[PDB]
Every structure is written in structure tokens, then in C-alpha cells.
Structure 1
Amino acid sequence: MKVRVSVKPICEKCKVIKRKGVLRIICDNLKHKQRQK
């Protein structure tokens, strides 16, 4: 959703992972999801 270049946690519940070579943010608040461009 927020295909950005700076991916940061938004709330304290967001968590940072790295999948197949891209940096991603996963959270319960699906509105907070992210991936690096």
C-alpha cells in the first residue's frame, strides 16, 4: 500500500521484517502495512 522509500514503524505495534530481499513493515493495523520501493 505505502510503497515508499523510507519505511518506518508508525505505531509501536508495527514490526520490521525482510522478505526475499525487500524491507517490509507488518502490523495488525493493516492500514500501517508497507514495503520499500
Structure 2
Amino acid sequence: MKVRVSVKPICEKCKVIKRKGVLRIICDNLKHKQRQK
């Protein structure tokens, strides 16, 4: 959704992971999902 270049946690429940070579944010608040461009 927020295919950005700076991916940061938005709330304290967001969590940072790295998948197949891209940096991603995963959270319960699906509105907070992210991946680095």
C-alpha cells in the first residue's frame, strides 16, 4: 500500500521484517502495512 522509500513504524505495534530482500512493515492495523520501494 505505502510503497515508500522510507518505511518506518507508525504505531508501537508495527513491526519491521525483511522478506526475500525487501524491507517491510507488518501490523495488525492493516492500514499501516508497508514495503520499501
TM-score range relative to shorter protein:
over 0.9
1:31 aligns to 2:31 (yes or no): yes
TM-score (norm 1): 1.00
For structure 1, the 5+ residue unaligned runs are none
Aligned length: 37
TM-score (norm 2): 1.00
Q: Deviations over 1:1-37 (max 9, x none)?
A: 0000000000000000000000000000000000000
Identical residues among aligned pairs (%): 100
* SS of 1:25 mapped into structure 2: strand
**Structure 2: gaps spanning 5 or more residues:** none
